[PDB]
Amino acid sequence: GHMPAISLPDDVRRRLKDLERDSLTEKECVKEKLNLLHEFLQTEIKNQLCDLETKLRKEELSEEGYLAKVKSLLNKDLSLE
Numbered sequence: 001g002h003m004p005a006i007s008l009p010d011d012v013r014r015r016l017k018d019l020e021r022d023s024l025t026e027k028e029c030v031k032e033k034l035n036l037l038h039e040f041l042q043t044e045i046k047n048q049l050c051d052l053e054t055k056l057r058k059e060e061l062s063e064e065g066y067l068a069k070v071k072s073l074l075n076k077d078l079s080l081e
Contacts (some may be wrong), residue, residue, distance in 0.1 A: 004081040012036060030070055037074060045077060 003060075019032065038046060052069060055061030 001081045006040070006081070008036075008040070012039075024065060033069065033074060034070075037077075041077060045073075048073065 016036075024032065034046075034049070051072065052061060052066050055062075056066055
């Protein structure tokens with residue numbers, strides 16, 4: 001990025017703050033975070049996630065593996081800017 005200037009909308013961000021009060025959860029965070037970020041993340045991102053689901057279905061990946069792997073990817077995508 002020569003000069004990036006894209007970041008989550010202020011209206012969206014406010015919703016997360018309200019959610020924080022309602023007390024989210026690890027599993028709940030991924031479901032909400034995925035759909036929200038998706039609105040700004042291309043489907044090619046969801047595609048990467050789809051392959052992981054296959055591992056969950058073949059019992060090759062740990063439950064916490066997907067939960068912990070998913071988080072990092074979300075942050076990595078935003079770090080690109």
